[PDB]
Nucleic acid binder design. Structure first.
Lengths: 71, 52, 126, 50, 49, 119, 85
RNA sequence: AAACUUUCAACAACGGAUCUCUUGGUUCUCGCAUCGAUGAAGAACGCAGCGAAAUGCGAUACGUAAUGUGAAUUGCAGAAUUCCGUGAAUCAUCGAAUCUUUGAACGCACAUUGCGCCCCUUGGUAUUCCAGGGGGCAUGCCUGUUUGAGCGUCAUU
RNA sequence: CGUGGAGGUCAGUGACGAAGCCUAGACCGUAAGGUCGGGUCGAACGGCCUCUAGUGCAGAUCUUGGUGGUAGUAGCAAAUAUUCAAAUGAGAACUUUGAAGACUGAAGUGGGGAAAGGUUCCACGUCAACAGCAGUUGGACGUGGGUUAGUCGAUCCUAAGAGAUGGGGAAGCUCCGUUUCAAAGGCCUGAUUUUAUGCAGGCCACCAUCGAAAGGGAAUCCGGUUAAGAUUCCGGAACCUGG
RNA sequence: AUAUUGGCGAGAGACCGAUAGCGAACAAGUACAGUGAUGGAAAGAUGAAAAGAACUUUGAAAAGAGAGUGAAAAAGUACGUGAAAUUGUUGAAAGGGAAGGGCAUUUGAUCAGACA
């Protein structure tokens, strides 16, 4: 996933099951004050939902990762 | 108990060279299947003349 | 003997009520008597043991050793007096579990609620 | 069957998370009669029947 | 851990003597199978080759 | 530690709302630290603190509605008595105690008189 | 030809997971469940099956509601709260 | 003559009988009446700082609030005020709440995590389009209200 | 004569060793059996007078569990076949690399998929069990990582067929039937300026719904990239439906 | 007044004591088999307390040998007592196509009683 932070400008999250692409796109835009270009989601084999969140080109995913903490 | 020993669905197989006449537990796969039942001599069977 | 209908005299009931008793009912069972010093002092025979009391063992191989309780281990029906241990072969130390009916309390650790308990059971305390 | 329904998939996820040995620290508890994971499953030995 | 790891070896022994290839081999032997012993085979069609 | 039950009851509705969002910011951060650290026992206490706020906020909204419908018939179904099914479908204390007009003249006339046989 | 070579042909499921009893006894073409009677209104049970009942009577489940009824009766179906004496 | 075969003791094996145990079963007596459209019995999936199962519970998820007792829990960690007290605990009690997706199952539908319509409300240059949040939409029957239907029929204009 | 429990009695025996078990050691009774010594072990058990019964086994092609002779024997022989050095290792006919020798020979021992299986896919650690020889290796065991779609499918439509409602049968669970002896229901513009829609007034008679991951069907392709993923992510370039 | 192998809370037994008693004393309607209706087991016990054997020395390691804890390892997570089939080692004895049995004595081994 950390490879996908640098190259693709993509954050990776675990998301609650009931959400769809509209609600994730609204929640990331609320919590982090960051515009989203497109969200791509998959269901993991262990039963939870992953979500690849690509940010826009104006915003950098390296700088947001320091604020939340994971790097 | 009046029903103790009778919670089984056995049935006899017939007359072969290598097997007895006691009714045996039907089905297969558990390890109880193929054992004697319903007799006073059988393991897991009722006793003779159940005390009333 | 037994002269009531709610009480039971059955052996299989009394062990099963003991082994599956909850912790609040294990507190009353894990009780320790007071010494003849304190029995003259407060006027009460027995008390439930507490964490911070000082105690003297009176029966067992460890008879004659005294120390403060570390912690009342209710899940094993046992009490771990401090300074009463067995050292292992590798230098490590292991506490010895005791039953608190074989203990004798010499000093009490008084809180507010322990005073009212002494008042309840008829104590003089001071 | 690689075209699976979700109800079929959700029961795979529960069988996947039960496919583990017993934890090591449960050996150390008081009055442990539990020894091994006696409900352990394997794809080779026993089919789980959907 | 070595206290716990040796308890894995102590509890493994009973399954190794019965040659279980896992802790998940619970294939059960039927005591007496029905098609082996319940039959009388005379002139005509028979129960196998 | 964590939040207390009785302390939150003195707070207002605007403050019980802002209490909760600041708690959920902590629980978001502690799930981040849960993967870096091997064991993080603090996350139990901040989790029950969120549940303690939601009980109090639900209670202040429900005791508002009870005084809204107080003294007026037809309160809603979750606010009524739960008692059981067959006891709600039954005659009340007034209706079972009703008796026809012919019996009421009789019970006044001939009640069960209290007597004794000694002398 | 009736034994082991025809057992290779068995790969179409007759039954699927039931929604009510979760039993894998739902016949597809009949659109009914052989174990628990669904989509009929009543649960399929019979008095010839004694062990059929004991697998699915009350008490084998969680009893989310009936485990509190004997306690709420013993107090007497009371309301309000305790008075902090 | 050893080897080998057979019989017997000693010690060691293979195996789990015997004796002594016991939180379970069985039978009799005694008391009691309390499931559900305010969503039950059952079912599926989820939850613990470290759990697969039993047990507990429902996105408030081995619980929360209320009450009682008055210092633990324990396999390791952790927290030290939570220790002369609005207060520990997998305690007990239980009168207030939550209660996912289902189930008589109730908007239609189901081998689909499928598909609508209505109201209030927020965001997108929006009564109509798309989306987010809250409350809704079954059938049979009863009493009542409201708008109606028929040369069935009465006065009247 | 013996065994399990019951009421008595010996103020019976017992952690200085009760029962149980072994014992080509002793004694008694014609016999069922009883007593004693020695070895083992660790906690309860007898004699007598009576009471009671789930009370005595060698056999039932008996029942459950356990062990032998046969026997280190039958066997491990279809699918043309393996060889040498080096590294790894306590160990190599079997693992890895290189050098040789062959085979499947495009209706394949190759490259993908549908049913079906459910993590076997990949990496790190590692061999008690399994792989009917072996094992350092594995589809094993231990811990983790990994499936991204406006365009590919499902979802939509109907086929043979399943099946509610209006009704009529049936003591009844429920059976018939699918446009039927039913009062079975929607859409458009307005005239707008209390603003909501009265009404201008028409048109329609079609009257649930389920049924194909091979039929019908709006719309995407190349090039890169990973230990494992792609017509799905990156870069580049297009098309479609609702607005 | 009367009925009750279900639910809930109680008390008892000339009952069974782990092949018995319910199928289930334990993570039991569990594991497992069958498309499905249904079928459906096995499995209690170290010791008072884990004090579950540091260290030393052989071997790659498993384990062994010493030491060591404990009243006892003849209680070492195969764990109380550990019978018989069956097997190993030592010792005694016999043996030309079975073995074992009965009556009597020799031979070798072995053993209590008893006179004061």
């Amino acid at each position: 996933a950390m490879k996908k932070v640098e190259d693709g400008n993509i954050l990776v999250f675990q998301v609650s099951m009931k959400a769809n692409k509209y609600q994730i796109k609204k929640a990331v835009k609320e919590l982090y004050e960051v515009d989203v270009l497109k969200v791509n989601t998959l269901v993991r084999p262990n039963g939870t939902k992953k979500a690849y969140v690509r940010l826009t080109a104006d915003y950098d995913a390296l700088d947001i990762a320091n604020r939340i903490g994971y790097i | 108990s009046e029903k103790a020993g009778h919670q089984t669905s056995a049935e006899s197989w017939g007359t072969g060279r290598a097997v007895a006449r006691i009714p045996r537990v039907g089905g297969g796969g558990t390890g109880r299947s193929g054992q004697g039942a319903f007799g006073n001599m059988c393991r897991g069977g009722r006793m003779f003349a159940p005390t009333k | 003997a037994k002269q009531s209908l709610d009480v039971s005299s059955d052996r299989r009931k009394a062990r099963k009520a003991y082994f599956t008793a909850p912790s609040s009912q294990r507190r009353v069972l894990l009780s320790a008597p007071l010494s003849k010093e304190l029995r003259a002092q407060y006027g009460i025979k027995a008390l439930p043991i507490r964490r911070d009391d000082e105690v003297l063992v009176v029966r067992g191989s460890k008879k004659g050793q005294e120390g403060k309780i570390s912690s009342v281990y209710r899940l094993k029906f046992a009490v771990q007096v401090d300074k009463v241990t067995k050292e292992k072969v590798n230098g490590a130390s292991v506490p010895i579990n005791l039953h608190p009916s074989k203990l004798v309390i010499t000093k009490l650790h008084l809180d507010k609620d322990r005073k009212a308990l002494i008042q309840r059971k008829g104590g003089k305390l001071e | 069957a690689a075209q699976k329904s979700f109800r079929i998939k959700q029961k795979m996820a529960k069988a996947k998370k039960q496919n583990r040995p017993l934890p090591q620290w449960i050996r150390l508890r008081t009055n442990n009669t539990i020894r091994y994971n006696a409900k352990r499953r394997n794809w080779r030995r026993t089919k789980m029947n959907i | 851990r070595s206290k716990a790891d040796r308890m894995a070896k102590m509890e493994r022994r009973e399954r190794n003597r019965h040659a279980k290839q896992g802790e998940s081999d619970r294939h059960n032997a039927v005591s007496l199978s029905k098609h082996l012993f319940s039959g009388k085979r005379g002139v005509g069609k028979t129960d196998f080759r | 530690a964590g939040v207390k039950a009785y302390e939150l009851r003195t707070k207002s509705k605007e403050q019980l709302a802002s209490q909760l969002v600041d708690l959920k910011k902590e629980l978001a951060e502690l799930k981040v630290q849960k993967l870096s650290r091997p064991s993080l026992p603090k996350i139990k206490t901040v989790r029950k603190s969120i549940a303690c706020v939601l009980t109090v906020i639900n209670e202040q909204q429900r005791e508002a509605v009870r005084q809204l419908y107080k003294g007026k018939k037809y309160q809603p179904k979750d606010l009524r008595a739960k008692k059981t099914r067959a006891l709600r479908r039954a005659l009340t204390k007034f209706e079972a105690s009703q008796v026809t007009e012919k019996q009421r003249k009789k019970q006044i006339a001939f009640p069960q008189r209290k007597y004794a046989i000694k002398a | 030809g009736k034994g082991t070579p025809s057992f290779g042909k068995r790969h179409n499921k007759s039954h699927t997971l039931c929604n009510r009893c979760g039993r894998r006894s739902f016949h597809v073409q009949k659109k009914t469940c052989s174990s628990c009677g669904y989509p009929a209104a009543k649960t399929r049970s019979y008095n010839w099956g004694a062990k059929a009942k004991r697998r699915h009577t009350t008490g084998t489940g969680r009893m989310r509601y009936l485990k509190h009824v004997s306690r709420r009766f013993k107090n007497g179906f009371q309301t309000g709260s305790a008075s902090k004496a």
